[PDB]
Amino acid sequence: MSPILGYWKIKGLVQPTRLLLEYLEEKYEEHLYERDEGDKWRNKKFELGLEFPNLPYYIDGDVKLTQSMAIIRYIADKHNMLGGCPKERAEISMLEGAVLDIRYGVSRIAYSKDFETLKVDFLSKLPEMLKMFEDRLCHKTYLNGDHVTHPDFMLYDALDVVLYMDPMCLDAFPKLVCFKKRIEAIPQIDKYLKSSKYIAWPLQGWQATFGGGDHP
Amino acid sequence: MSPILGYWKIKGLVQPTRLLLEYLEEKYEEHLYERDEGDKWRNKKFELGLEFPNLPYYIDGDVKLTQSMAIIRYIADKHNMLGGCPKERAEISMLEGAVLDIRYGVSRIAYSKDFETLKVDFLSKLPEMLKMFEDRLCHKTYLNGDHVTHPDFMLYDALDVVLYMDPMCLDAFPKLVCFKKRIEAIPQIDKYLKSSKYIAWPLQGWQATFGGGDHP
Amino acid sequence: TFDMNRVIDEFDEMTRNAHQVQKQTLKEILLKNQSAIYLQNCGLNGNATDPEEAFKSMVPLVTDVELEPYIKRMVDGDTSPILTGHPVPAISLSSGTSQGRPKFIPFTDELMENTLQLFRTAFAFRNRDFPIDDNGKALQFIFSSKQYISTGGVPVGTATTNVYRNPNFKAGMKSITSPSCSPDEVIFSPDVHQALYCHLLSGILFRDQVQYVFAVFAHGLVHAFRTFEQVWEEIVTDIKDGVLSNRITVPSVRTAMSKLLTPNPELAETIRTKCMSLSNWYGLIPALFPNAKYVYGIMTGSMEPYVPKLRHYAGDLPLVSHDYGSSEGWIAANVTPRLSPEEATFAVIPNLGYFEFLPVSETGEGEEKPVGLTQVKIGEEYEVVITNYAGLYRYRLGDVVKVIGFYNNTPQLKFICRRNLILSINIDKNTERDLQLSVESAAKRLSEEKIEVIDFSSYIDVSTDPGHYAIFWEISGETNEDVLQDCCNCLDRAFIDAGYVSSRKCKTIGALELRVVAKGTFRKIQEHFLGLGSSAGQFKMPRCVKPSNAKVLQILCENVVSSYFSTAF
Ligand SMILES: N[C@@H](CCC(=O)N[C@@H](CS)C(=O)NCC(=O)O)C(=O)O
Ligand SMILES: N[C@@H](CCC(=O)N[C@@H](CS)C(=O)NCC(=O)O)C(=O)O
Ligand SMILES: CC/C=C\C[C@H]1C(=O)CC[C@@H]1CC(=O)O
Known part of the structure; x- marks a missing residue:
């Protein structure tokens, strides 16, 4: 069976995996619950043969999968991009750690509490974390070298995320923007932005205090 | 130049790692920084040169890495575990991921002010994922094996910790208690459970209103 | 004061008296374009009863590379004309290239006067068939x-x-x-x-x-x-x-x-x-x-x-x-409006310039001796050479045309030119390989709004300290300004040559400026280029323009959808 990816009608944790399919030119199929189909999969949860009910899930010829951490790993390696050493798949995961803590970080409470009040305390601790990737990247085109990679894709989602959060988040580290554009530079992913599959927003769940609603 | 795992005297991110450094029978040394060594936190990170700043940190004689989830797969590959294997890497991670939802779920609440209401509902939401774990375990002794891997103590940390906050959450799952029974049964871990190195509390940094503080 | 049949009359009588009128206009440019030291050290001194034949062998032809230095003088800091006539009100970039570099031709008042007259002849002839x-x-x-x-x-x-x-x-x-x-x-x-x-x-x-x-x-x-x-x-x-x-x-x-x-x-x-x-x-x-x-x-x-x-x-x-004409000069006009576009052909205007024609025929190509326009043979293909008042004397565009027929004694022409391309070595290079990848790289962010890039260009600005960037972009539809800023940054890091990229990184060349020109701009310069008085096949676009290029230059500073200097650095 050909690759089947299911996810919420949001970019979400699923942007890096959908985006990684296209840099890799991997072809995929999509089943997405719309405005109220999320509840319907109740009956479908234990009848899917899936080990642990949730989204995303992944039915192919070879395996039954779910969750963002796991799916990114499984797809990339078959296509030779999960990592090459004890040191660097770790480095990958660490860089994953860096984007996720900041991204799962915006999402602690972006659809919860007063996001603006909690914005200020987190936008108080972010400069170091943002400044770390900009200093490491001066000699390399991206974080790890010369061919675009998946840490960059959650990172792509990432850069979008503090900038929609805070427009002038990025006033003092200019390198990241040209760099996002260089990962965005690959022809195929551009065309899918061009194509019908591209969904600009919301990044998080539909009902979000911040980043929520059908229309910006 | 014995390998350094550097971290606070807290369960948190490092808890799966300590016991597990002993599974591979690998040499290691510790730097213990206390609640009162917050002054240490400002002054240590870049003085030894971290590109990606975070705790916990672990340096083998040649490696530089942080972030709990990243540290774990690090330990596993040194134990020749990756190479790659798909299902399990994606299934360990899924298994791990359900618990990351559990582990970071408690960490979400970890800095929260109320705690009790978030936990009981965290408790209300625990039987789903545990049942997903439960329906994994019966044919064999533990979560995915015969003789201990890395993913064990994390669910354990998760399940151990959750047993402390509520005494009867594991009552309906007999297979999970043998599971609890099984790792305290293997020679190295129970033997070191009574040693000075063993760390039981607190679950999060002492700042947490619950699972912080002092007494089990 | 336009009279429909009177303007066609001036054209009709003119076509009949083409030979006499042309040598007079040859005399005119010769009497007018004279005193630039270029023409005299080439040997010109004026008049006589000897103005045509001796001129062609004696007075020299020109190409874009040799034509490059003299208006280069004029455009840079000090207006210093030595090959044209008057210091030009505006300069025109010519199609094709000069060893891979920008082409130079001056633009005079007569063309605007010639614009009104050629068109005046055009639509009037059209009006007889299209009232x-x-x-x-x-x-x-x-x-x-x-x-x-x-x-x-x-x-x-x-x-x-x-x-x-x-x-x-x-x-x-x-x-x-x-x-x-x-x-x-x-x-x-x-x-x-x-x-x-x-x-x-x-x-x-x-x-x-x-x-x-x-x-x-x-x-x-x-x-x-x-x-x-x-x-x-x-x-x-x-x-x-x-x-x-x-x-x-x-x-x-x-x-x-x-x-x-x-x-x-x-x-x-x-x-x-x-x-x-x-x-x-x-x-x-x-x-x-x-x-x-x-x-x-x-x-x-x-x-x-x-x-x-x-x-x-x-x-x-x-x-x-439409009639075939250019910033170099107006050469031809359509006086047969009823005929289809495929069989359509354009009438040479007698008083605008002296055209001689470089022979193509005997093998490929040719160095055979040139002849006069009316003296050209029917059915054969030759590449045009232009001497006119745009300061162009025997300027080779590099393009070959066939003779469809004759409105009286003046020839009508068909142009099967779709590429006149020949090239050499460019030093604002920065080749197309790198530029195409760069413009295309920065293209995706706009594409998030289902908009794509129509066309691209770049510039060498020595007015500023330092000499630098300047980029042209045409897109299908309107978009916001902040995405463009960021696009400028990709373009900033995209060009990858050591000298350029090292200077770019530490601003030894100024921080990239992104100005979004509006749609049809490059289309409009394309409008100019195909019509280039010669063989209607002249459109290949120079991609980075020296202070020396010209069509593109007028375009850059004011007509900005938005203008931004690098959101990098
Ligand atoms: N930490 C887990 C949980 C992530 C999560 O919340 N996934 C959502 C999709 S955005 C889900 O599966 N929800 C299932 C439901 O609707 O109950 C993971 O990374 O997969
Ligand atoms: N995802 C990251 C986030 C880790 C994190 O926030 N760590 C805390 C320790 S629990 C920290 O370093 N805090 C800095 C401090 O309190 O000084 C990871 O797991 O490493
Ligand atoms: C009356 C001519 C004025 C301007 C030039 C152009 C137009 O306005 C439409 C086409 C015409 C000829 C060309 O292509 O050179």
Whole structure:
């Protein structure tokens, strides 16, 4: 069976995996619950043969999968991009750690509490974390070298995320923007932005205090 | 130049790692920084040169890495575990991921002010994922094996910790208690459970209103 | 004061007296273009009873590389002409290239005077086969919105623009042409893309009376109606409410429309029902306007692949080919409006320039000795050489044409040129490989709004300290300004050559400036280039322009959708 990816009608944790399919030119199929189909999969949860009910899930010829951490790993390696050493798949995961803590970080409470009040305390601790990737990247085109990679894709989602959060988040580290554009530079992913599959927003769940609603 | 795992005297991110450094029978040394060594936190990170700043940190004689989830797969590959294997890497991670939802779920609440209401509902939401774990375990002794891997103590940390906050959450799952029974049964871990190195509390940094503080 | 048959009379008598009139005009340029030390050290001194034959062997031919240094003088800091005549009001970039570099030709007053006269001959001959209403207006895609000041403090400008912004534009064209849909202010408007849809809207507002639909070539109309096909629902929603959309940011265009904006629910209903009913958007031009006579533009040479799609848009209506002319000079005119575009051919104007022709025939190519235009042999192909008042003396464009026939004694021509390409070595290189990857790289962010890039260019600015960047971009539709800023940064890191990229990184060359020119700009310079007096096949676009290039230069500073210096560094 050909690759089947299911996810919420949001970019979400699923942007890096959908985006990684296209840099890799991997072809995929999509089943997405719309405005109220999320509840319907109740009956479908234990009848899917899936080990642990949730989204995303992944039915192919070879395996039954779910969750963002796991799916990114499984797809990339078959296509030779999960990592090459004890040191660097770790480095990958660490860089994953860096984007996720900041991204799962915006999402602690972006659809919860007063996001603006909690914005200020987190936008108080972010400069170091943002400044770390900009200093490491001066000699390399991206974080790890010369061919675009998946840490960059959650990172792509990432850069979008503090900038929609805070427009002038990025006033003092200019390198990241040209760099996002260089990962965005690959022809195929551009065309899918061009194509019908591209969904600009919301990044998080539909009902979000911040980043929520059908229309910006 | 014995390998350094550097971290606070807290369960948190490092808890799966300590016991597990002993599974591979690998040499290691510790730097213990206390609640009162917050002054240490400002002054240590870049003085030894971290590109990606975070705790916990672990340096083998040649490696530089942080972030709990990243540290774990690090330990596993040194134990020749990756190479790659798909299902399990994606299934360990899924298994791990359900618990990351559990582990970071408690960490979400970890800095929260109320705690009790978030936990009981965290408790209300625990039987789903545990049942997903439960329906994994019966044919064999533990979560995915015969003789201990890395993913064990994390669910354990998760399940151990959750047993402390509520005494009867594991009552309906007999297979999970043998599971609890099984790792305290293997020679190295129970033997070191009574040693000075063993760390039981607190679950999060002492700042947490619950699972912080002092007494089990 | 235009008389329809009198202007054709001047042309008709002229075609009959072509030989005499031409040697006189040869005498004219010779009497006029003289005292530049270039002409005299080439040997010229004036007059005699010996002005033609001795000239061709004696006085030397020119190419773009040799022509490059002398206006280079004029454009840079100090206006110092030595090969043309007067210090030029504006300079013109010529098509093809100079060893991979920008081409140089001066633009004079006579052309604007020649513009009025050639066109005057054109439409009058057209009017005998296509009678017109004198009180009507026309739908024309003509833009003169961009002007720049040279490093020497001199204006540089495309042929077309220089004419439109000239003090004599209105008096010279009041009697002889049907009014533009868009106000002149809108033809001069900072946003030609926005001017493009509003002028188009302007057309629909007076659909019953319009007699023309105009651009210089076919594919520009084509892209326009794709846009119309793309944004027509956008047009009618604006009309129902009577409020112009918020996509539109430019000061002059929104105020024009606000005055022209009255709630018209009904028109939007009429247009909407009619527009959706048609199948596969083939030929919407007469439907929108029930009384228009024709579609006007260039339809030969490189336009042949674009002829079916204009035909696609044209349907059953007669196709009229625009006269063949340029910033170098005006060379030919269509005096046979009834004939189709494929068999169409353009009449040489006797008094505008001395044309001699470099022989191609015996093998490939040829060095055979040249002959006069009327003295040229029927049915054979030769590459034109031009001596005129644009300071061009024996200038080889590098392009070959065939003789279809004769309006009396003056030849009509067909141009099978679709590429005249020959090249050498460029030192603003930065090759196309790298530029194409770079422009394409920065392209995706705009593409998030389903908009794609039409065209690209770059510039060498020695007025500024330091010499630097300057990028041109044409896209299908309007977009916000912040995505563009970031695009500038990709372009900033995209060019990868050691010298350039090291300087770029530490701002030894200024931080990249991104200015978004409006749509059809490059299309308009393409308009100029195919018409280049020669063999109608001359459109290959220089991708980075020296202080030395020219069409592109006028364009860069004012007509900015937005202008931003690097959001990097
Ligand atoms: N931490 C877990 C949980 C992530 C998560 O919340 N996934 C959502 C999709 S955005 C889900 O599966 N929800 C299932 C439901 O609707 O109950 C993971 O990374 O997969
Ligand atoms: N995802 C990251 C986030 C880790 C994190 O926030 N760590 C805390 C320790 S629990 C920290 O370093 N805090 C800095 C401090 O309190 O000084 C990871 O797991 O490493
Ligand atoms: C009267 C000529 C004025 C300007 C130049 C151009 C237009 O306005 C339409 C085409 C015409 C000829 C060309 O292509 O050189």
